[PDB]
Design a protein around this nucleic acid. Structure first.
Lengths: 56, 209, 48
DNA sequence: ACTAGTATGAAAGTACTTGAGCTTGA
DNA sequence: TCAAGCTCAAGTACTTAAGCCTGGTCTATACTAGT
């Protein structure tokens, strides 16, 4: 009755792809490992949900 | 108000005199620029149900050559003109032998009468103008350059010199307020002299479409 | 000093409130530079 | 069972169409 | 006085939003015969 792919493959898809759903994208980004400063700055990053290319 | 009305009627009279003179008519020189006080003396200083009422100052002018054609200008009493009002003017025109005329409407025309004006255009031509169009001679404005209607011989000379057709000239609307001022019909090239800051003078041409 | 006037120079350096107000003015400049580009390029495309 | 194949908030502006109101004609 | 026609205004729907370039990661799931 309990199939395990619907609860594990969904988490794996939403973290591996970043398409946050089956909605928005870019939630889980690949970690930036050029510099330890870049690694720290990628783990402390906030994203405004406002979309891009706005003239305001 | 009554002084405001005689001022407004005098400015419409002045602009119609300048319109007839720029269109190429017999306009008497003192009539072409009279004083407001001269208008008040000649007509009576009370447009509010008095002596300078409408239909007293219907200006009849003839042409500077070929003095047969005339456009004896109309001033309706009512604000909103209609067909049963313009057919009285049609009766006054068919009493005559002359086909051009100008009516000066106060408010807007009923659009059935707008269609009616086009409904006798090969027979006899009627132009209409609102009061706000004739409180300012727009050819005196500094943005408006010198428009001159060209004769058909000059159009043939133009197209034969530049080896181009009437399809190729830059064009102008028929409902253009300067085109309405000169009363030009479709297909009638208008030379336009304007000062240019890079050559001095530039004469462009506007065929009417 | 409360409303954003910076009385220090870049040789002396800014106090933290003046640093933050200066960062606000700079963010306004970068927003102008980043938003200008697409609209100016589209005006150029329409004109050509 | 079970397995693989099968099937489905924080755009802006312009133009066109529809509805309502006003005027004219019968 | 009523009906029809024409014009104007309002509401709704459709089309576009920089130029080039370099990297990466990841790509269905549910089911039903068909053994």
């Amino acid at each position: 009755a309990i199939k395990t792919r619907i609860i594990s493959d969904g988490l794996k898809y939403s973290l591996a792809t970043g398409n946050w759903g089956d909605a928005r994208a870019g939630v889980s980004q690949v970690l930036n490992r050029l510099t330890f400063a870049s690694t720290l700055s990628h783990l402390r990053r906030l994203n405004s949900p406002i979309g891009r290319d706005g003239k305001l | 108000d009554d002084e405001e009305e005689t001022y407004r009627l005098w400015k419409i009279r002045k602009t119609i005199m300048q319109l007839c003179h720029d269109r190429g008519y017999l306009v008497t020189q003192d009539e072409l620029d009279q004083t407001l006080e001269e208008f008040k003396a000649q007509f009576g200083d009370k447009p509010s149900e008095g002596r300078p009422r409408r239909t007293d100052l219907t200006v009849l002018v003839a042409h500077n050559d070929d003095p047969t054609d005339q456009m004896f200008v109309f001033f309706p009493e009512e604000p909103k003109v209609g067909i049963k009002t313009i057919k009285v003017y049609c009766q006054r025109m068919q009493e005559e032998n002359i086909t051009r005329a100008l009516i000066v409407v106060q408010q807007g025309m009923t659009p059935s009468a707008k269609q009616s004006l086009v409904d006798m255009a090969p027979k006899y031509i009627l132009e209409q103008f609102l009061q706000q169009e004739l409180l300012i001679n727009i050819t005196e404005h500094e943005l408006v350059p010198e428009h001159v209607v060209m004769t058909k011989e000059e159009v043939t000379e133009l197209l034969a010199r530049y080896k181009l057709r009437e399809n190729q000239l830059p064009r102008i609307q028929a409902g253009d307020p300067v085109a309405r001022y000169f009363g030009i019909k479709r297909g009638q090239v208008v030379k336009i002299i304007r000062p240019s800051e890079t050559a001095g003078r530039y004469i462009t041409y506007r065929l009417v479409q | 000093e409360s409303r954003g006037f910076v009385e220090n120079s870049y040789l002396a350096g800014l106090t933290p409130t003046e640093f933050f107000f200066h960062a606000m003015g700079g963010r306004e400049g970068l927003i102008d530079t980043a938003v200008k580009t697409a609209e100016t390029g589209y005006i150029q495309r329409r004109l050509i």
